[model samples]
Target: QSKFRHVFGQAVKNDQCYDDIRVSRVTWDSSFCAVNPRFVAIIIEASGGGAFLVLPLHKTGRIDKSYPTVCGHTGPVLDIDWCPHNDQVIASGSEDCTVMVWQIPENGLTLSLTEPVVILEGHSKRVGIVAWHPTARNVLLSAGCDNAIIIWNVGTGEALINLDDMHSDMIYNVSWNRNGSLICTASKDKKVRVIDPRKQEIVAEKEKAHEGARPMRAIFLADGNVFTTGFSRMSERQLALWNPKNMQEPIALHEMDTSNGVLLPFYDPDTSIIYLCGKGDSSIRYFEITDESPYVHYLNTFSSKEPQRGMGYMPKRGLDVNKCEIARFFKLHERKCEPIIMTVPRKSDLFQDDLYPDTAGPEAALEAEEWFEGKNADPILISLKHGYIP
Candidate 1:
């Protein structure tokens, strides 16, 4: 039997689920933020308009009825991302065709934030997704219904690069590579494009990534490869591993059960593990990627009774490595948010060689200019400390 426990601390269980706490209903697959682990952000559906809420993660027991909420977008906030370099900085894309960047106060949010530190306006249509550069500060990307992707320098609220030509249809997803040099975007046009933001060019593209007409999603793997999830003509969900170097064909393809919810993939570069989260699904499926053929190996599914509306993953630094936990997910349920911990159990206290191998950590210093100048610096590698708990 799996030794993992789904126990919720008394504080988390006693609090009302997010749906119940929220004033307005949440949108489908509404974006959730937990990058810093110190705070969790979500879109709150309200009567007048949707707002963003940031709740402290360390607060145990039922949370105070009041927390920090930011409301500036005229339309529903579709997507949001936390800046990788700064825990206090966050960016959100809205249905109003704009992206707003905000900085939370160090003392904590006590009231509603009516204005953003920076408002990036460029997209002609509703902005659907927003992402921050993995290793650079203030470098952000926003994709919209206009079939355009804009890279921004949040410091000046300027649109640095406007990638409008590559994607003919609305882009469904956008992600940065480990070192932040290349970006991959999937679109309704049924194509996936790997772009070099600095050069402002599409380096490579794959046509008809899946047979279905629905929106396809893709993420960059640590080894500079790509992982995608889409649907087939028959509406069955599919997963594929691709080598970006060659877009001719996917290295491997695997089909899953038919589902209406789009699969949101989260990749942990440290572990080379990809977690597939399906909208409205009650379970999370995960797989491991290796250098060998059939690169993707099915791991196991973590199942829960309640379906999830959205999910957020914590960074490697936020994890409790001492517990043998490699990953943690904050799963949003109707009116509730639950924490799910994933760990590899070892009968003996010895470090699990397969699970605790040395992995890449964040860069020692964040250099925005170097990244913008097209530098692909390697990540500062950090090895896990080995110990036996007895």
Candidate 2:
């Protein structure tokens, strides 16, 4: 077996028992700011209900169900984030069209939150994303299906600002830079724009960012560069890196996958690693960004033999994997980790051989294969017989 394979061991048969614990979302409080630490929080979207779970990295990624169920959102909670200012404070956005703020004890072992300290209800449609201000504790933002973006004061439950003037379709993504003064947005409309909240003006806009795209995602890099992804005309997913100073066109455009890539991209500043997961394929891609170059180089990719973790699940990375850190299932963590690959289950509805014919399945596979032909595969977490330990 290869060194990467040894890290995770061999893939075993999928167990239905573990399937029940499928992770709807996973995140870390400190964004892996420290080392070999666990303190990880996972949000399990059970068919019955949604609950917040605490998984200890020091405990070998073992999850305890004793954590509290944040009850209130009538629908499944879709998004969660840890307050940068206070690790115990967590924010969640749900399909019910509300953003909630809760205070978890510092120990975080506290099982339940009796009531939310603050509830942000303003989105006219389902809340798709919630993000905290980069440097402010009481400030946060939520983008929704209503095609509106709302800035909120988490301390007082006040709406600070609303960007109802932008985007024609669902605004699924919103992000802030190192300083909260700048905000970037991505939408199903195949466009990304940088907004200056104080001036309330679009600093830059890209309409034809990618052709035939859906669910495009954008973010600002450490050096004020902007990176985003969407489908190309050939149905292949592409990654575009832009300089915020000159956002009219991408400074460097690289293709992450050549198939129906559906997952979001995570950028780590500490290690300069870019992690990519195939939305429809059972694989994870890792790329490294150099300080001297705008180009991102392919580092590795990992595939899971087990079917339970999803043949292809979204990949999330931290600032340092060896350091104790927490990652928000998606939006919460943004530190840099080395080229580490995480194996997750494939989305059941999309990858089943029974649901999709072999021809169609391999068509995208072929596209992805050609795109990542000679890339190395680096496996990070190894799934063992009992539980996964680093």
Candidate 3:
């Protein structure tokens, strides 16, 4: 049988829903939500400043209007990312042309989180994307409207490397590979470039990767393949898989229906399955990338009555493996945030070991200084057999 053929998505109870979204209406396409095993954080619009609400994972149900928020940015927050190595640490990008990293207490916020552990300043324009290095500690990357990408060692609060001449237009997304060695980016200049950040060199690039004028989202996958989602020349949505060795032609190219929403590519490397979460659309489609012909195979699609404005995907370690759950997501809209869980049906064919392999644990494989010194290491993998402990 095909992989996860009978898998389906289930919505959490209505009582667990968080109400009154007013989510980030910024001029960007990020999901505006981030979650970890310890906390679930989402950017919300309120109090006349850029603010976000961070709650304990169990702090579900209706969040009060008087709830405390992290309102340090003077401009609207564009994006937020949680540090993989530390649960209490998170980084935020703002329309105020700055990026701030904060340290939350174990008990959640009481008053406004107005102060940050450190603030990174370099870009002259609004920062839209902020991401952490996969296998390194305290290494963060931010791309802004200045058409530049800055890599920072958050521990020292200094810009470690700045690659300024890479793009001529705004950057859509920047994703690191599994080992934090290479990065793949989608830029408005209509090119997908791969760069070795430490060396500040462009390894390879492909022009017109999707033949579309809209923004593209790319993920540097675990198996060293690159998966991209974007619009086509005629405004139709398209998906493609690329091999860095030969960027001249994609390994797979396929066209989807004419939906105008920007597709955000969410990949679960352990399962080798990629979920296409559509913005301004109500359905989520998935595909499996394989070594066989055609490269990408379509799985089932989950359709909902309400379109999702943003989404927060849980890390694999935070999933409930006992229920055969493969993925859990907090789906966003204009009003409410609902939880959706994906499960591999409990038939006799449950290959739990293969489905839940050793995944990237919280431990960092390389220190920021070591990675900056031209060293790379694989993620320190942990077993999900008995479930993970923080």
Candidate 4:
């Protein structure tokens, strides 16, 4: 459906102190912020060295020079993921072969955070990706160039599980399931593996999932299925939705435009919508997933003039559901951050109130043990009020 396209909002320029940002595709999460997403974290290459810059998302003008810069990584910061359990905590993987966890001050940070609250050092090579357990506390997963994945207990700074022998080459991406039970990983060897952390074994795997030699990425769907984006032998981009339980072949596969940049897939379970963003492209293509065959239906794309270095999607709780705005994105450009708002436009304001329902908000408590023990918990959601205006 082309009915819902994205609308542009105000643009925010980086402060004068910030120089050229590292635009190279980082293996981990980039250009995204934490929940209630107050700040956008990015890696910048300055005159002396590379550093992580956390810019206030709400502040549009030049970010004051006094804003705190996270400066623990001696090498370039490759990837960063915000802890879903705590808004203040963030985990970053770097070329230094370490995953450093930092806690941001609730009050706007005014000084540099030179020391990490916890340092998880186990990976033999440079860490590539750091993903937080979706519904747990103090739990983090990191993949590195050593062809290993380490699950860490950030509270104690210990590597809980070190899985190195499964993959033949470097790990490119790692994603957690909705309840933090299963993890899906794609590596340089062109294989996809679904691993259960508790058993410390592979639950399911597929060989040569993508014919191309480039890196592939996979994320789990809410229905316990898997969705992947990779390149074909002919160098054409392809998106596949498969049942992890039956990995013989994908249920649905579609070829997209050829692009050198990896296609990053972001899924919103509340809406069953998948947003595909190419690293070097200025457009975002989205699709709606269904339970039937031909599961993914192409939707309209949101295009912009400037290409994006990275993009961060705000949580559903942080969005303005009253206006029928389903999602918001913070797009990183050469020297500025732009906010793009996506809404299902309607003729009547009354239509929006009934059109969208309440979605899951932030959790009140983060109980890792409870979540791991198969305890089912629902996120505290923001209920929609009557008389909403678009």
Candidate 5:
């Protein structure tokens, strides 16, 4: 039997949820929510200034309208990402055609932060995606509607590489491979390409990975499989797995209903489980990828009446292993963000070694310079046996 076959999802109490949040209004496929162990930030739709709220994870309950916000961009913030290496650092891509990085205070912001530590400019059009390199320090990647992908070294406030020739149309999403060596991108040109960012070369590509012209997302699995979500020819939502060796055809593809919401993927590399949901969707459908045949196995769906307009995935180190908590999510409603906990129903309170294993820790494995010089390092793994430690 699957250990997590009976996994359960429970939403926190109302007092535990953050209320009075003003979610962004722009129609886009960006993840407006960013979460870490310390703080959880969600995009805000200020009349003029692009903004986001950074609240301490423990600061639940009603949030004031005038609460301190990270309001700096002139245009609405499109995507926000918290640095995996440093929980205090975060980056934002916006319609202002620039990228900005901010360092949150250890004690959380007392007032709105209008100034950024570093502002990166390169994209001619609105920047849509900003993903922090998983294994590198001070490294960030951004995709823009200008049909370009720019890799920046945040420490120096400089763009390290710009590959404008890679894609001919707007890029839907960009995902870093298991290591920091490569990136996989889904673009408006209807192509999924595996690329070497440094060399600016397309290592592999598949056209019309999903027939429908809607936006799609491509993520790399722990075992090197590329899982993609898009739409089929009839506008029906679809999911597929690709074998890197032969990009011409997917190893397997499945068609979900004609739900219009684009499925945004949240994958836990260590656990081999992926959670897929979308804006305007009221439930999250999860599946597990195994080594056995029929790789992607549908597990269960976490349902709610309210649709999630914004979302955030918690890091493994932040989970409550002692309580059998395997994953956690911040599901944003119209004006509130709810904490949904996922756990395995264990028979006893004893430690579950088979379910809990070494996972990605905060310590970065490589610096930007080292990663740029063709150096590859796996995520620094640590045990969660004793829970979080200083």
Candidate 6:
């Protein structure tokens, strides 16, 4: 996503931003004050090697190619996020078992980062996620396939806390709360845990939140509610909702047809709506919570001509959607059942005519089964091999 500056309550998308580039990872720096929208950083995964890019939004989104490349990890960069304290600094985790902290120029134009400011090498496996402390600029946390979470000091280049007491399986996601006092993690172990970063203790734990669900995705809503989705053994897939304060169990379980596809979920705090999309299905599902009772209502189920693979939602930032702004819906292409970065200009607009004339019908559903034929002997059996456990 490109950086947009809001001047006098009017948002302007950077028109001269990077285009026709293979950007595998992207992040923005809007922590201090979202006034100027200064920096737009991206990690481009090319055939030869991956390179990091930093563009200043002030000069009409001009690329700073002088210090354009951040080279430390040999593998592809997976994720990157800005430090809340110092907006000019960004933290990145890669597949090369290392994390690097980069400091950008604050005011100058010709300055270049000759080398990485700080190199954090501790994880034994691939580094998947790197998140900065909400309040402290020197503090950061990272988790990956090593099944451990490592807290680091950006200033001292030292591992502050190492959490090997939590999940036994591969850790997929790690998130910090608003205050930076607590951290939450989700893993292939089908559990989501809340931990005190300062105390280095597990404050709460939810075991088997998604039973036998591999590649489970979890995130915390702004209202302190937790949402997660996973595979089910029976005909229906499940999306679970829990409260970190309660920590007893899920408050609501919404089920969808497993035959349609695996459910991928995204929560929009601006609208308080949860967006769900199935792996092999073309429809997008929306659910909302009215009061504290967790009212799971399907707002809309819309289909697209493009087959759904993986999805993400750009949280509402007061941008104008009048000109088909990218919203809760987007299209993506697949390569060997994995989602590559989409390059097409996908605008969220209602279909008026037969745009994709070659759109498939009910017979196309059968093709989905063929798409996963050689991947599993009995894909249905693999999906329906688990149940809810307390």
Query: Lowest lDDT 10-mer window, candidate 2?
Result: 355-364
RMSD (Å) per prediction: 3.6, 14.3, 1.9, 3.4, 1.7, 16.6
User: Worst lDDT window (10 residues) for model 5?
Assistant: 381-390
Give the Cα lDDT of each candidate: 0.75, 0.55, 0.87, 0.74, 0.88, 0.54
In terms of lDDT, model 3 sits at: 0.87
Task: In candidate 4, list every pair of residues with a backbone clash.
Answer: none
Instruction: Report the lDDT of model 4 for residue 386.
Output: 42
List, in order, the clash count of every candidate structure.
9, 30, 0, 0, 0, 1
Candidate 1 structure quality by residue, lDDT tens digits, 233-307? 999999998888897988999998887888889888766777888877888888878777688877778876778
Which candidate, 1 or 2, would have the higher TM-score against the true structure?
A: 1
Q: Give me the displacement of residue 89 in model 4, in angstroms.
A: 1.5
Say which prediction, candidate 2 or candidate 5, comes out ahead on TM-score. 5
The best candidate in terms of lDDT: 5
lDDT of 3 at 53: 85
**Order of quality (TM-score):** 5, 3, 1, 4, 2, 6
> Which pairs of residues clash in candidate 3, taking residues 3 or more apart in a chain or in different chains?
none
Give the Å shift of residue 163 in candidate 1. 0.9
Off by over 4 Å in 1: 1-19, 23-29, 60-66, 350-366, 381-390
All candidates: TM-score: 0.89, 0.69, 0.97, 0.88, 0.97, 0.64
Predicted structure 6: lDDT = 0.54
Write candidate 2's Cα lDDT for 1-390 as tens digits. 111221221232222012223455432111211121224444555445344444333333223455355555666666667665455677777777888887765554555554678878898887758786655546778887788888886766778678888778767478887555688887677778899865668888888777864567788877778888777787778888887677777777876556654546677553456666543355556666765455776766556432112121112222222321212222111111122223322333232222111110001111112212222221123211121123
lDDT of 2: 0.55
lDDT of 4 by residue, 273-361 (tens): 88888777888888888876699888768876778777778776566755677777777776655667777666665545443566554
Candidate 2 vs candidate 5, lDDT winner: 5
Model 5 Cα displacement at 139 (Å)? 0.9
The list of candidate 3 runs beyond 4 A from truth reads 348-351, 388-390
